[PDB]
From Swiss-Prot:
Free-text remark on how the cofactor is bound: Binds 1 iron-sulfur cluster per subunit.
Presence of keyword Magnesium: no
BP terms from Gene Ontology: iron-sulfur cluster assembly
Keyword Transit peptide set for record: no
A GO term, aspect molecular function: iron ion binding
GO cellular component terms, semicolon-separated: cytosol
Cofactor(s) needed: iron-sulfur cluster
Binding residues annotated for iron-sulfur cluster, in chain numbering: 42, 106, 108
Organism of derivation: Haemophilus influenzae (strain ATCC 51907 / DSM 11121 / KW20 / Rd)
PANTHER family on file: IRON-SULFUR CLUSTER ASSEMBLY 2 HOMOLOG, MITOCHONDRIAL
Protein name: Iron-sulfur cluster insertion protein ErpA
InterPro entries xref list: FeS_biogenesis, FeS_cluster_insertion, FeS_cluster_insertion_CS, FeS_cluster_insertion_RrpA, HesB-like_dom_sf
Summary of subunit composition and partner proteins: Homodimer.
Family to which the UniProt record says this protein belongs: Belongs to the HesB/IscA family.
Amino acid sequence: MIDDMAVPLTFTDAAANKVKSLISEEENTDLKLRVYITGGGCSGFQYGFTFDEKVNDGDLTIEKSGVQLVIDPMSLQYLIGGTVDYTEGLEGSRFTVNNPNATSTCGCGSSFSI
């Protein structure tokens, strides 16, 4: 096997699509996504995505559906083994991620709404 790809937060397929799609449109060649910290609360569940083909020393890299993902250590601890998925369209390019620090633990206490 390898020893570079697949490290922390694993994203979906579309998140890759948003990259390989607009990057290929840039005429770059085959950009590699590069996540950063852009969540909401103190935990984090979003993380801003950019198209960085270079590398970014001290940046873990996870291969993508059609490209390569590389996030910064700062996010590394925020996204750790979480899950991300992208859903762009009319409503707008919405981003959603899930991790232990984000979801956290409640203790199972009914489920409805606010």
